[PDB]
């Protein structure tokens, strides 16, 4: 395990052979030194006698406790799962590296001495926000704009692409990129590509999810999201629908405006607080940035500003040719006819029209889509 990290040779030179021979000789010498211990004074099996003695010494029934402090010298203070605080000491196999409040410490059954640590596999906040699988295909599935695709790449992937180019320039990646655009502009579609291309951990945060019902909760949720993402690994955590900070008012939360304000202040602190957050990137999007708190956007907390406009009349062509790739459409109609049907047909409009045309073709169970299906879908989409 990590015996030698020198691989710089990367060839058939004699240096690599010499290093390998020296390592083999050292391993053989260590093995020879170790073998004589059992040859002369084995005194036990050393394979199962030790394990059996450990099992019979440490309390056989190990309970689920909780470490709450640190006592280096053969001592520890915790509370019994029933509630009674304990002064359980440290055992031989303590391996005292997880001595932090919360990790259950397993004590003996006879004398209740610390027997084992509590392997933790929960991370509730992280799990309620961890992306398991890639959302969508590569960036080519976004289509049309790519004014931020290069910009977003430089902001996130470029730091992860080969972080020597920004190193050779003597700078660190941009702080943050906030994607603001018209409703249904495809901001979520941008995060789709970000995740399908992403390399490090990614967390998804529902915008309203930062505002809780119990007073003081929202700041706790923000601090917990920050801890989970930062403490987990290099991450790209997107808190979508940031406008929900104060735009929508709900009676579930006991606090009024001074609760959304507190949540926003806690978010700002967690973004640019008083410590080193580490290697963590943030990419948030909103559709109404006119009401977002001005402090949460000052260069230093959210650095890169990205605006997403509606698909262009030239971009609409690529959008349509993309969203209808696998459709068995009949050559009766020409997409350009509906291309100019809507004066302000956004990206979501093309997908809605395609889906409506597919559904209409389905109602008759036909094999292809006719021009009339698209005509009837266009009115049902824009007109309602």
């Amino acid at each position: 395990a990590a015996r030698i990290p020198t691989v710089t040779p990367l060839t058939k030179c004699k240096l690599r052979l010499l290093k390998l021979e020296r390592i083999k000789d050292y391993l053989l010498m260590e093995e020879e030194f170790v073998a004589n211990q059992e040859r002369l004074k084995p005194q036990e099996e050393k394979t199962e006698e030790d394990r059996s003695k450990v099992d019979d010494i440490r309390g056989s029934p190990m309970s689920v406790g909780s470490l709450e402090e640190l006592i280096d010298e053969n001592h520890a203070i915790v509370s019994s799962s029933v509630g009674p605080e304990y002064y359980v000491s440290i055992m031989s196999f303590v391996d005292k590296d997880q001595l932090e409040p919360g990790c259950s410490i397993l004590m003996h059954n006879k004398v209740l001495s610390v027997v084992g640590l509590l392997q933790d596999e929960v991370d509730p906040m992280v799990s309620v926000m961890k992306v398991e699988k890639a959302p969508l295909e590569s960036y080519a599935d976004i289509g049309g704009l790519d004014p931020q695709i290069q910009e977003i790449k430089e902001a996130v992937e470029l730091p992860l692409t080969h972080p020597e180019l920004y190193e050779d320039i003597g700078i660190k990646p941009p702080k943050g990129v906030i994607l603001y655009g018209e409703p249904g502009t495809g901001k979520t579609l941008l995060a789709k590509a970000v995740a399908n291309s992403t390399s490090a951990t990614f967390l998804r945060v529902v915008g309203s999810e930062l505002i809780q019902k119990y007073l003081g909760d929202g700041p706790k949720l923000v601090r917990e999201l920050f801890r989970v993402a930062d403490d987990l690994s290099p991450s790209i955590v997107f808190i979508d629908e940031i406008d929900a900070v104060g735009t929508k008012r709900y009676d579930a939360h006991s606090g009024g405006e001074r609760e959304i304000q507190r949540t926003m202040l806690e978010l700002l602190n967690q973004l640019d607080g008083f410590d080193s957050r580490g290697d963590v990137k943030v990419i948030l999007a909103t559709n109404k940035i006119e009401s977002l708190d001005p402090a949460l956007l000052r260069p230093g907390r959210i650095d890169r500003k990205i605006e997403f406009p509606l698909p262009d009349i030239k971009t609409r062509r690529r959008i349509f040719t993309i969203h209808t790739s696998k459709m068995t459409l009949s050559d009766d109609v020409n997409l350009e006819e509906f291309v100019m049907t809507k004066d302000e047909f956004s990206g979501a409009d093309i997908k809605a029209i395609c889906t409506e045309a597919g559904l209409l073709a389905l109602r008759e169970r036909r094999m292809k889509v006719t021009h009339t299906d698209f005509k009837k879908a266009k009115e049902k989409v824009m007109f309602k």
Partner: protein, 149 residues
């Protein structure tokens, strides 16, 4: 002692890895009190390894390992061997190892490390060697033998 001294002087400067491995294996054997045969083995390891810079580096690493796991005789011999390996070549790592060794509780190891330091800095007039020697002289004012060394 005679056999290992003959083997060491025979293969000195030849860089034959197999003889170095044999000497290391001989050193790795725990010996009852009275056998001074390990020191000659370490010196022979250094003599064989001097020929190659890679040999010098691997010998330095093996000497560090032996110092960590060596007996009192091996501990006394290691400073002399590593001083032999780097005569007139003040390598920073070796100088730091000698600085750490010169403060050992055993006086003989201390004088061995001091003499190795003097050998390494021979003819280079290194300021760092002079300074650390001054510090050692200040530390060892009360001891006549240490001051002499």
């Amino acid at each position: 002692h005679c056999d290992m001294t003959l083997l060491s002087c025979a293969y000195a400067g030849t860089g034959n890895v197999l003889k170095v491995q044999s000497l290391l294996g001989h050193c790795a054997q725990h010996l009852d009190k009275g056998e001074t045969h390990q020191g000659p083995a370490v010196l022979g390891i250094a003599m064989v390894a001097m020929a190659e810079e890679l040999g010098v580096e691997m010998a330095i690493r093996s000497l560090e390992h032996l110092l960590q796991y060596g007996e009192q005789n091996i501990r006394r011999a290691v400073p002399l061997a590593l001083g032999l390996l780097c005569i007139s070549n003040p390598k920073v790592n070796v100088m730091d190892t000698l600085s750490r060794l010169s403060h050992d509780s055993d006086l003989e190891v201390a004088m061995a490390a001091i003499i190795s330091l003097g050998l390494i800095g021979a003819g280079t007039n290194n300021a760092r060697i002079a300074g650390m020697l001054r510090n050692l002289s200040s530390y060892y004012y009360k001891d006549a033998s240490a001051l002499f060394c």
